[PDB]
């Protein structure tokens, strides 16, 4: 179990650590989060009490370094940093734990929610979507745009998700226009899975990362990416059986975790109605269709 210490908490802020969130008061004696499960990526995220504008945060994996948070009064945000002196770090953490100044990652033992939301998400792939090679952790916020959004403006601050575009020459083989537009299997299996992602695990990892950025930061381009990746599978007549079964589990846990009162903005009516009721895979997502119908029957 690993730890992310905080130098201090000079400004009042709501701190998220994965699905969990807590409130820290201005200059409250808070020095970080302990008992963070090893084996998963994690995200630590922030919404200041004064300016709810800009949710922002950091993706990280405690196996890749010792990380801490320090508020920067010039740039006005809580920054993640890496401590290279391992003994300085262990000594800082031990003192903060002894003084019981750290909150505990409150993971219920029965609860597989975070695993189920991050099953295919790997730090190395995150770092290719979010480019900042001098750090082992990745910053994301509410306003960052995607490479595809910038085509339709700062490139260094972009989310480099895989571009999916159903009316594009990549998606449509000359001479198969009707076939490829109405059945996207070519584009899913040959162009994307074999060509770009290499396997379904990397495809699902990007899909899961896009959902989590949409949910935790309100990142609109990430929501667009999540729905495009669902629609590409559902609009393919030919999808490996193991992929459909796994997709149903992935979406089930995403819909289960979504805050009820954000569903209006985080869920695209057209995509979901098409996927669940009109598409080739309309009968292949039993768990997802059951939770959607019982939790969000209005959207449909």
């Amino acid at each position: 179990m690993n730890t992310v210490p905080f130098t201090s908490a000079p400004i009042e802020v709501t701190i998220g650590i994965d699905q969990y969130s807590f409130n820290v008061k201005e200059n409250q004696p808070f020095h970080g989060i302990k008992d963070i499960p090893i084996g998963h990526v994690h995200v630590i995220h922030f919404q200041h009490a004064d300016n709810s504008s800009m949710r922002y945060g950091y993706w990280f994996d405690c196996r890749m370094g010792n990380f801490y948070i320090q508020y920067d009064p010039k740039d006005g945000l809580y920054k993640m940093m890496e401590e290279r002196d391992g003994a300085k770090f262990e000594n800082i953490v031990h003192n903060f734990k002894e003084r019981q100044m750290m909150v505990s990652y409150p993971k219920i033992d029965e609860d597989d929610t975070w695993y189920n939301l991050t099953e295919f998400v790997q730090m190395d792939k995150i770092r290719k979507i979010v480019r900042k090679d001098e750090n082992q952790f990745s910053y994301v916020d509410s306003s960052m745009t995607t490479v595809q959004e910038n085509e339709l403006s700062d490139p260094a601050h972009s989310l480099n998700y895989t571009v999916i575009n159903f009316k594009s020459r990549e998606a449509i083989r000359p001479g198969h226009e009707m076939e490829d537009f109405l059945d996207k299997s070519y584009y899913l299996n040959t162009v994307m899975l074999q060509g770009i992602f290499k396997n379904s695990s990397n495809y699902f990892g990007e899909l899961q990362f896009a959902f989590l950025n949409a949910m935790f930061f309100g990142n609109y381009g990430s929501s667009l990416q999540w729905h495009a990746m669902i629609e590409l599978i559902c609009s393919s007549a030919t999808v490996p059986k193991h992929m459909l079964d796994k997709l149903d589990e992935i979406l089930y846990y995403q819909i289960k975790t979504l805050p009820e009162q954000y569903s209006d903005i985080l869920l695209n009516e057209r995509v979901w109605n098409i996927c669940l009721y009109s598409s080739f895979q309309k009968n292949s997502l039993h768990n997802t269709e059951k939770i959607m119908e019982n939790k969000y029957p209005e959207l449909l």
Binding site: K167, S168, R169, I172, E177, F181
Partner: protein, 237 residues
Amino acid sequence: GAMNSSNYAELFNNDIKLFVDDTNVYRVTVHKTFEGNVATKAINGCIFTLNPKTGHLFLKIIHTSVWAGQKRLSQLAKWKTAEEVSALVRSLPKEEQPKQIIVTRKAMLDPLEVHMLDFPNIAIRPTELRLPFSAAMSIDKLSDVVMKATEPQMVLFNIYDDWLDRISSYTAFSRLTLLLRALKTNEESAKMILLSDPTITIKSYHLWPSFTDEQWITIESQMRDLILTEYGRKYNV
């Protein structure tokens, strides 16, 4: 974006554009089977592709053989239309290719857009106008060449005959749409109007009769007659 009454003069500027109407591409007769079920029998159709500035009509005849063994024909018909329009554009020299293609039905937007991906600079546009191009098969010489076709074929016409020698393309398009609206609302009467006088003939190389300027005014009045007198019978006025 969409084409409507507010931007109607754009049709007659010097940017090449084509209207595409797919109404008459997939045509059937519905009939009873010996068992008392219902079946369809396809008949020849056509794509109506028109330059509204010059009157040039590219009439691609759709022979019933193109439907043999195919499913979901009404959907295929839209993609076949888009394939044929794309083939026509590619066949034209660069300086004759359209800058815009306006489809008369919005269901043609995605099929045409996909077939024209190679032409990113050609705009594919819908329209709010309710154009009467479905009535093209009420023009006798067009109907005749479609029904006689025994194979796929493209036939080129000027749908304005020689009118542009005497009138502008705005006026010619207005006359055409009036004639076609009348043929669509009451074909028998519209055709009676156009041919009642045996002394006014259709030249071999024309589609419509050789009316003088004054006779076109009479003809055009008689067609309005018809469209306004229908409106009232259809609704109330």
